Design a protein around this ligand. Structure first.
Ligand SMILES: *[C@@H]1O[C@H](CO)[C@@H](O[C@@H]2O[C@H](CO)[C@@H](O[C@@H]3O[C@H](CO)[C@@H](O)[C@H](O)[C@@H]3O)[C@H](O)[C@H]2NC(C)=O)[C@H](O)[C@H]1NC(C)=O
Ligand SMILES: *[C@@H]1O[C@H](CO)[C@@H](O[C@@H]2O[C@H](CO)[C@@H](O)[C@H](O)[C@H]2NC(C)=O)[C@H](O)[C@H]1NC(C)=O
Lengths: 212, 227, 164, 109
């Protein structure tokens, strides 16, 4: 019924700047119920805005809240280092359905970078079971959007990506992935070339690293 | 001052039963409605239960079945009974305070929003619980030992439950270490990877030790990467 | 002699664009908070507590007793919170009855932990008469009424002594 | 004032109603005034209003006198923004019948 759609999916800006994150529900929400909450990484959530305009009983003035009916917006003028949270708009009130739901993962992303690539052969211990689950890497890169495809002599896209993305580092503000191609000994001993293709925007050509 | 102390458990069977207790302090309990908001292992806040000051419980279709809210205005506590627990019922459960009755003087302000939050208590459903970590690193003679082409790490496969602590020489490697988040594979068991960028020709010098700490099953692995 | 309790203005109908679910800790029952079963609390929803002119015509052919209240809040902001209007009026009329209520803010001493109060009022709508309620806030509207029959040979006695 | 006395304290206050528009604004500097008097089981709101009434003891303006009995334990709060003739001395009575009001000319001996 009430659907709180938070646009954009992800927001990324440099400090000292201004951020505008929007939240539009299916039908009109009649302000008095809609509020905004800051999910500070690794901690319990926190209330910032209520009844649309209203400020929290202990929160900075950098944050602004306004909107009516369908479209609503929380505007952070300062965008300090602390102000890098995930944020959600919630529809609390007479319904009784709270609705909630949101995106807008406000993160850093300042200067373009590209991913590095690796690939490792199956060790002496995992091969004792017969089952081989080969790893890959793509350490440190500013633009989070990356696509990983495996080449088993020009095949495989099922038990392929076991993506394990990390969070921006305190110094570098970059990400690192670890796609794991898990499989049976059926096609493992059967073939020779096993590649890990990094199809990233940062890199010029879709570079690949393989083994025996 | 104002505080919501959350307590409960962590592990249950799939189709099991668990109860959560929410202690409160610093404000008048009986005049505020209460709720339970869960954040999945991944992300996304979702409301699961809500009880008025009058004791009227409201639940979302997701959980209307087997979850029930209660209040001990006397014991300043609120409770959640989680019966016949599903698979997706995993995550951190939060305790919250929204609206002031209607008939509550005029002192404590009246607003439509949740202010006092709790720290949480993580809840998970079983498969084949308590299994130690299996760590296999990288053996001698690999790719190319250089400055650029440099990354060599272990593999913490098939372990349950979370968490697992990563250590390289009992807390010496403060740089270049990337401890990837623990991810549950198909048919249970969490599995994380931990890589470390190596120097140009420091293969010998001082060999780095791959230490792994598991507090549930009390397992400790000391199998290092190529000496 | 006798009467009959009846829902004059039913909760789940008669108040469409006003939030009826008003309750208090002061009206506690078995632990939870509650309210007067014969009265009903009207508060402001979504935007405001819009204007109301709820009417009841005495069909019953008996003296129908009507009971309503008027809420006087203790704090300026509480008035504007629950009723969204800072200057409110409650009007209660019959063919031979009139009264205009202007609730006013007062930080009064705490009786049952309440600085704010609700004044209770009553009338008897004669068979054939009609009761009209005009309001823009602060009305504790009736829910159930009493359509009495009367007959002396009855009275109020103050006794400790047990019944047998 | 909180009733400490453990006796019924009688409180007496007045409310002034001026005769001329300007006199209201002179002595009370506010053209629209309120006087509020409360106890646990008492409430009253006074709005004094301008009236050029006939001269009783050379006064077109008047002061209305009001009274209450604060029960032991109760508290009397006075809210105002003008026109209040506040109490100074009060009476903390004890009561006991065998007394009354008699209208007599006759002398005492
Ligand atoms: C809710 O009730 C109040 C009364 O308790 C309504 O307020 C009154 O609304 C009428 C609207 O026709 C106002 O009349 C206007 O007066 C001017 C005078 O110059 C005239 O030019 C206009 O053509 C019109 O007749 C009236 O002033 C107003 N009363 C007050 C004190 O503001 C209110 O409209 C009701 N709400 C609804 C939705 O009906
Ligand atoms: C708010 O509720 C009231 C009461 O049900 C509605 O008021 C009626 O409005 C019509 C005009 O549209 C009048 O002729 C009726 O007499 C009113 N009822 C009463 C009891 O006086 C009002 O329309 C509702 N408003 C909304 C927005 O739903």
């Amino acid at each position: 019924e009430i659907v709180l759609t938070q646009s954009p999916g992800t927001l990324s800006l440099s400090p000292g700047e201004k951020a505008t994150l929007s939240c539009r529900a299916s039908q009109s929400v009649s302000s008095y119920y809609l509020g905004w909450y800051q999910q500070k990484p690794g901690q319990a959530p926190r209330l910032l805005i209520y009844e649309t305009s209203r400020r929290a009983t202990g929160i900075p003035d950098r944050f602004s809240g306004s909107g009516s009916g369908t479209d609503f917006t929380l505007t952070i003028s300062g965008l300090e280092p602390e102000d890098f949270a995930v944020y959600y708009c919630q529809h609390y009130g007479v319904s009784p359905v709270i609705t909630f739901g949101g995106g807008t993962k406000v993160e850093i992303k300042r200067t373009v970078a590209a991913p590095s690539v690796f690939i490792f052969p199956p060790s002496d211990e995992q091969l004792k079971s017969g089952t081989a689950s080969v790893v890959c890497l793509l350490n440190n890169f500013y633009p989070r959007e990356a696509k990983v495809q495996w080449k088993v002599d020009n095949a495989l896209q099922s038990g392929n990506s076991q993506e394990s993305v990390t969070e921006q580092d305190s110094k570098d503000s970059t990400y690192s992935l670890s796609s794991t191609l898990t499989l049976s000994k059926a096609d493992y001993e059967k073939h020779k070339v096993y590649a890990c293709e990094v199809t990233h925007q940062g890199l010029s050509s879709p570079v690949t690293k393989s083994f025996n | 001052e104002v505080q919501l102390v959350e307590s409960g458990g962590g592990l249950v069977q799939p189709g099991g039963s668990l109860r959560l207790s929410c202690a409160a302090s610093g404000f008048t309990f009986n005049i505020y409605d209460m709720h339970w908001v869960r954040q999945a292992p991944g992300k996304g806040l979702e409301w699961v239960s809500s009880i008025t000051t009058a004791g009227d419980t409201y639940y979302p279709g997701s959980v209307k079945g087997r979850f029930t809210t209660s209040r001990e205005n006397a014991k300043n506590s609120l409770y959640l009974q989680m019966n016949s627990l599903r698979a997706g019922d995993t995550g951190v459960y939060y305790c919250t305070r929204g609206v002031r009755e209607v008939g509550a003087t005029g002192d404590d302000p009246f607003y439509y929003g949740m202010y006092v939050w709790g720290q949480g208590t993580t809840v998970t459903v079983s498969g084949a619980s308590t299994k130690g970590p299996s760590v296999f690193p990288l053996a001698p003679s690999s790719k190319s030992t250089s400055g650029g082409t440099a990354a060599l790490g272990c593999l913490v496969k098939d372990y349950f439950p979370e968490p697992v602590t990563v250590s390289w020489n009992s807390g010496a490697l403060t740089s270049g270490v990337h401890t990837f988040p623990a991810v549950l594979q198909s048919s249970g068991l969490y599995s994380l990877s931990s890589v470390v960028t190596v120097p140009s020709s420091s293969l010998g010098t001082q060999t780095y030790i791959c230490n792994v700490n598991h507090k549930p099953s009390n397992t400790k692995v000391d199998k290092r990467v190529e000496p | 002699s006798s009467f009959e309790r009846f829902e004059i203005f039913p909760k789940e109908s008669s108040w469409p664009n006003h939030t009826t679910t008003g309750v208090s800790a002061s009206c506690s029952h078995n632990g939870e908070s509650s309210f007067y079963k014969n009265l009903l609390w009207l508060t402001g929803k979504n935007g405001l507590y819009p204007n109301l002119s709820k009417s009841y015509a005495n069909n019953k052919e008996k003296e129908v007793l009507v009971l309503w209240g008027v809420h006087h809040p203790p704090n300026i902001g509480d008035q504007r919170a629950l009723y969204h209007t800072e200057n409110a009026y409650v009007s209660v009329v019959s063919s031979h009855y009139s009264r205009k209520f202007t609730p006013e803010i007062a930080k009064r001493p705490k009786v049952r932990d309440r600085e704010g109060r609700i004044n209770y009022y009553w009338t008897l709508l004669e068979p054939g008469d009609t009761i009209i309620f005009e309001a823009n806030g602060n009305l504790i509207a009736p829910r159930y009424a009493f359509a009495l029959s009367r007959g002396f040979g009855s009275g109020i006695i103050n006794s400790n002594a047990p019944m047998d």
